């Protein structure tokens, strides 16, 4: 059953050079390559969201967690550890009228579906204790109905450790790129995102929503659930734009550097000269 739990705040931070991904599946080495497609511009103004569930409040005016626009593509980032972020929802109306794409990760698999979900206003996986040993996850608070399912995909899970994703929806394909990076402090430097899966779904996507997971709270082992344990999930969102990038491949074939041609005159000169 749908319940509103999440209060979301936002700040603004700098995407220095993150979001670069391999544009094709062709091996190149010791070469500079010029490409033109949807990239996250360097030093972009990305939004840092904090989704907070605090248990034991009063009133209902504090719950605000609306779905975000998809624009031309999304750069998603997180630095979470306790599996609080489980996946995503993509679609236009996020109800039974249209089709929507749901991605869920649970510790052994990723489930990707395209169905006419009647999503809840504040969807989240409900993790509850069974037999005082196991924890079971329910989708009854993610959607109320899933009908007319047209796509399904099961594989290994997608999800101090920064997790970066790039989602694009082009020519009937939902392309995902991923990277995991051990960090200490958005970092400096480069971490080229690698292709993950190309889903052949011809869906119209305008909005997306992050899917969390919440554990039920038990005051004592003899008591029932009194709600969900207080939680916090922080992530970063940026938006792709059509740009031309000069990517550098090293001897081993990895993308070690990039230049945003439209960023400023010096980078434009570098792109014109095809040199760094």
């Amino acid at each position: 059953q749908c319940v509103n739990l999440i209060t979301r705040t936002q700040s603004y931070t700098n995407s220095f050079t993150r979001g670069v991904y391999y544009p094709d599946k062709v091996f190149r080495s010791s070469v500079l390559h010029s490409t033109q497609d949807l990239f996250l511009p360097f030093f972009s103004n990305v939004t840092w969201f904090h989704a907070i569930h605090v248990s034991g409040t009063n009133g209902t005016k504090r719950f605000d967690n609306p779905a975000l626009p998809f624009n031309d593509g999304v750069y998603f980032a997180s630095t979470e550890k306790s599996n609080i972020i489980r996946g995503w929802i993509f679609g236009t109306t996020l109800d039974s009228k249209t089709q929507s794409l749901l991605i869920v990760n649970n510790a052994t698999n990723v489930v990707i579906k395209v169905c006419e979900f009647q999503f809840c206003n504040d969807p989240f996986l409900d993790v509850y204790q069974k037999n005082n040993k196991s924890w079971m996850e329910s989708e009854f608070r993610v959607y109320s109905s899933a009908n007319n399912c047209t796509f399904e995909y099961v594989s290994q899970p997608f999800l101090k450790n920064l997790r970066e994703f790039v989602f694009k929806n082009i020519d009937g394909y939902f392309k995902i790129y991923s990277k995991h990076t051990p960090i200490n402090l958005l970092p400096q430097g480069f971490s080229a995102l690698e292709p993950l899966v190309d889903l052949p779904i011809g869906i119209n996507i305008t909005r997306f929503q992050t899917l969390l997971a919440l554990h039920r709270s038990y005051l004592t082992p003899v008591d029932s659930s009194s709600g969900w344990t207080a939680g916090a999930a922080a992530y970063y969102v940026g938006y792709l734009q059509p740009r031309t990038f000069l990517l550098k491949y090293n001897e081993n074939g990895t993308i070690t550097d990039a230049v945003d041609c439209a960023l400023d005159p010096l980078s434009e000169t570098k792109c014109t000269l095809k040199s760094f």
Partner: antibody
Amino acid sequence: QLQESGPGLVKPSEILSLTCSVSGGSINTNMYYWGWIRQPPGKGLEWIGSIYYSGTTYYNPSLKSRVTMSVDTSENQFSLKLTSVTAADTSVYFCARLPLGERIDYWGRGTLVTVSS
Amino acid sequence: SSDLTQPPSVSVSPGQTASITCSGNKLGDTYVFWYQQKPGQSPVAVINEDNKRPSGIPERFSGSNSGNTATLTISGTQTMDEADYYCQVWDSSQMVFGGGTKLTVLG
């Protein structure tokens, strides 16, 4: 504390209307749903529907075309309407509060409605 | 879930143990709640979340849930335990009740 109110006699092919008033607490909470459960005399319990502070509703599929529930947070009330009633709708109706919308902790006293001409 | 099956009647001698069974597809994957209704009154929850007793319920009420079967066990059954017991589950978008079991105490 939950109290039901409404007519106890309804003509067939007319509208059954009930209202539950809540005291000692506020409907304006995210932790509870507010539902209706009916029981024919001598028979079992059947859940009619549940409503949320924001107006989100769940309905019994066998009555979804005839059931409509509304919520009034200012007055701490929630109401049920059932159209095109027949004798099969003669029963005792409880208004209940549903912790997390999955169980019942407090029931109403129950009001008996008879559908007859 | 989506279908709960209950025996219509269970008869037990005083002081013995009464077992009321609820059957459904993959009940072990969902919480089951037990309600007791005495004649002329409103139901009261005796068990929540398959094994939890709310406040005020005698310690002789116990619950279990495994596979496709949920069990409500009353130990040292007394005359006052003579009532109607219902199992309840929440499926995707509906609340499902059992048919109800009438507990009779012999002797």
